[PDB]
Amino acid sequence: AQRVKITTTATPGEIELAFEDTGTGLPVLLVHGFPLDRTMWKAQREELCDEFRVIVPDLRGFGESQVIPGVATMEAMADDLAGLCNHLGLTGKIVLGGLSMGGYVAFAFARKYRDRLAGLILCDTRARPDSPEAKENRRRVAERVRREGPGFIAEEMIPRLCCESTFRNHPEVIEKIRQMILSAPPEGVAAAALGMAERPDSTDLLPALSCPTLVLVGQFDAISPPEEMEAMARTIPQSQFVVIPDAGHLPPMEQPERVTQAIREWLRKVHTE
Numbered sequence: 001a002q003r004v005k006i007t008t009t010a011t012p013g014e015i016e017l018a019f020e021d022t023g024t025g026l027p028v029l030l031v032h033g034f035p036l037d038r039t040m041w042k043a044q045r046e047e048l049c050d051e052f053r054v055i056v057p058d059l060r061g062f063g064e065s066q067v068i069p070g071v072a073t074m075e076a077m078a079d080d081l082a083g084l085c086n087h088l089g090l091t092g093k094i095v096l097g098g099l100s101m102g103g104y105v106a107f108a109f110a111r112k113y114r115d116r117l118a119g120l121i122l123c124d125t126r127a128r129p130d131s132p133e134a135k136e137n138r139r140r141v142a143e144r145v146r147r148e149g150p151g152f153i154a155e156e157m158i159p160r161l162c163c164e165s166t167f168r169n170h171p172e173v174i175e176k177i178r179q180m181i182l183s184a185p186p187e188g189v190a191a192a193a194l195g196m197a198e199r200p201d202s203t204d205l206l207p208a209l210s211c212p213t214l215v216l217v218g219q220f221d222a223i224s225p226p227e228e229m230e231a232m233a234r235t236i237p238q239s240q241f242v243v244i245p246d247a248g249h250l251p252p253m254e255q256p257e258r259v260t261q262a263i264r265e266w267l268r269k270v271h272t273e
């Protein structure tokens with residue numbers, strides 16, 4: 001992996017990002033969820049790199065990236081991605097994928113950097129903003145995690161993140177996810193929780209998208225359910241919708257080969273030299 005200070009148009013103008021960059025050819029940037037890190041895309045990065053260049057950063061405040069206290073807006077995270085692409089000399093078009101919060105970041109990127117997208121991959125996410133109670137729950141999480149760390153988040157989220165079959169067949173995946181959460185920097189978690197609370201409604205952005213979009217969801221996703229994601233996909237032009245069997249909210253980890261294949265075959269259609 002690499003760690004580089006990038007220039008970003010978001011406050012504070014420069015930030016150190018840790019990232020993986022594996023493969024050659026057409027660039028695919030994959031954005032993790034909350035409160036995870038780049039390692040949740042490891043299987044896809046290690047497999048797709050035979051055909052694509054796969055870039056997987058830790059977002060600001062997560063993993064090994066710099067922590068910027070306060071509020072980490074989805075826009076700021078998108079600005080950081082643009083700055084990373086600039087650093088790397090990826091100044092033309094990319095495919096951008098995101099899971100959950102990473103999907104929120106992808107919408108912020110599409111809003112601001114439309115001309116840099118060859119395609120979007122939206123996994124286990126939604127375009128609407130937080131409801132008022134959800135916003136308040138962000139704030140409650142932020143205030144507590146600063147002091148207690150993320151153990152209480154792992155306790156609340158793990159049962160909602162993966163399906164029954166994953167608990168049975170893949171306890172090692174459960175434990176990897178748990179360690180991602182437990183290791184997340186407390187102030188990075190807080191800043192992103194507050195940022196998510198203030199993200200805009202992206203509902204009306206979706207019909208205005210100008211690139212092919214793959215929408216992926218676990219069959220048993222308890223957080224962003226398949227019915228809801230299918231309806232979201234119906235609002236996006238040039239969309240393809242895929243349900244991954246025997247996965248919950250984290251298909252890339254729960255059913256890595258299925259996710260890799262779905263992404264690979266779509267990329268072959270979209271992302272050409």
Ligand SMILES: [Cl-]
Binds near residue numbers: 103107199
């Ligand atoms: Cl957003």
